[PDB]
Curated annotation (Swiss-Prot), chain B:
Post-translational modification: Phosphorylation in NK cells upon engagment by SLAMF6-expressing target cells is leading to receptor activation.
Swiss-Prot/TrEMBL GO biological process terms: immune response; innate immune response; positive regulation of interleukin-17 production; positive regulation of natural killer cell mediated cytotoxicity; positive regulation of type II interferon production; T cell activation; T-helper 17 cell lineage commitment
Chief localisation class: membrane
UniProt function note: Self-ligand receptor of the signaling lymphocytic activation molecule (SLAM) family. SLAM receptors triggered by homo- or heterotypic cell-cell interactions are modulating the activation and differentiation of a wide variety of immune cells and thus are involved in the regulation and interconnection of both innate and adaptive immune response. Activities are controlled by presence or absence of small cytoplasmic adapter proteins, SH2D1A/SAP and/or SH2D1B/EAT-2. Triggers cytolytic activity only in natural killer cells (NK) expressing high surface densities of natural cytotoxicity receptors.
The Ig-like V-type domain, residue ranges: 11-96
Residue ranges constituting the Ig-like C2-type domain according to the UniProt record: 108-185
Record organism: Homo sapiens (Human)
Residues bearing attached sugar chains per UniProt: 34, 63, 113, 120, 137, 154, 179
Entry domain remark: The ITSMs (immunoreceptor tyrosine-based switch motifs) with the consensus sequence T-X-Y-X-X-[VI] present in SLAM family receptors have overlapping specificity for activating and inhibitory SH2 domain-containingbinding partners. Especially they mediate the with the SH2 domain of SH2D1A and SH2D1B. A 'two-out-of-three-pronged' mechanism is proposed involving threonine (position -2), phosphorylated tyrosine (position 0) and valine/isoleucine (position +3).
Range within the parent protein: 25 to 215 of 332
Cysteine disulfide partners in this protein: 123-190, 129-171
Lineage, top ranks: Eukaryota, Metazoa, Chordata, Craniata, Vertebrata
The protein's name: SLAM family member 6
Complex formation: Homodimer. Interacts with PTN6. Interacts (phosphorylated) with PTN11. Interacts (phosphorylated on tyrosine residues) with SH2D1A/SAP and SH2D1B/EAT2; SH2D1A and SH2D1B can associate with the same SLAMF6 molecule; interaction with SH2D1B is mediated by ITSM 2.
Membrane topology: Single-pass type I membrane protein
Recorded superkingdom: Eukaryota
């Protein structure tokens, strides 16, 4: 039961949906973050629950649902990490694990070229802003993948090359951008 | 940040002491074990504490001093690992880390004789010391007449009744938490 991978957007909010199977009576629930604890929760049927925030900082931007799912708002980079819900029953203490990732939304996708004759050879590079190591590019023509990197170099002959355009697609877990360029324009 | 290495003996107990306040005041304490939480403690300076244990695995085995120091009794191998105390002040949550290693007592020490079969009065002995199960952590040393003659299992001596006196070669095995000692006599081994 390895960690559920969830993606938060920098600046915005996110919920880690604490769930079951259960069956036995929950006595407590603890929300853990990395080495540390975030929140202690004594659930109650009749009453509101007693909630104890054990981690000052994060805690400012921290709330809980009717079901004790973690709600984290105005997400920061230092928010990334392993979150875990420990449902302390009377004979067991099972863990739900999440991996929270925080990424800026991709913006400003751009394409530049670097160079006649009858046969045209283009050197294309796709760039983006607010990238990370976990961005990923690919160049596509007619639904075919010419390249899986920001760099594409291809030959284009107006009179036998079947495609007429090249399209860069840049995406991460929360962004999907694309720019396309015209051989017939990039080759004079 | 350290953490503080602690040696528990299998089947015995061990506490883990806390350090505060040095200034701030604690609203709660959380004792953590590896991936999980063990206990939430809500102290009352003015009264008694509210101790919600969050991991029942540790049965009657888990306990807390008047000082909210964690104490585990009848330790098992499964207790090995990291314990952290999260002391929640208003403005932060500092951790006292511990790493608890569970060692077993040494049982059954043995000396074995790898000498030559027939002894020629000018007697030469190759002995070697053992413990029931060898661990990287076990340390041997031999002693005779107040002199330490080795710092490993093996011992080579020589002995001649005509000039050397009667004495016992004594192995001593030990690890962090315990020790044993067996002692053969030269007169016996050499005949
Ligand atoms: Ca709420």
């Amino acid at each position: 039961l390895t960690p559920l991978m969830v993606n938060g957007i920098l600046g915005e909010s996110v919920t880690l949906p604490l769930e079951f199977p259960a069956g036995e009576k929950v006595n407590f629930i603890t929300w853990l973050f990395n080495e540390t604890s975030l929140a202690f929760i004594v659930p109650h049927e009749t009453k509101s629950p007693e909630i104890h925030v054990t981690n000052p900082k994060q805690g400012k931007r921290l709330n809980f649902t009717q079901s004790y799912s973690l709600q984290l708002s105005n997400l920061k980079m230092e928010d990334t990490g392993s979150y875990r819900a420990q449902i302390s029953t009377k004979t067991s203490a099972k863990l739900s694990s999440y991996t929270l990732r925080i990424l800026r939304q991709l913006r400003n996708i751009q394409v530049t070229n670097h160079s006649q004759n009858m046969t045209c050879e283009l050197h294309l590079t796709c760039s983006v802003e607010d990238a990370d190591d976990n961005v990923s590019f690919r160049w596509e023509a007619l639904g075919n993948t010419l390249s899986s990197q920001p760099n594409l170099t291809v030959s284009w002959d107006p009179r036998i090359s079947s495609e007429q355009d090249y399209t860069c697609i840049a995406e991460n877990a929360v962004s999907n951008l694309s720019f396309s360029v015209s051989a017939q324009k990039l080759c004079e």
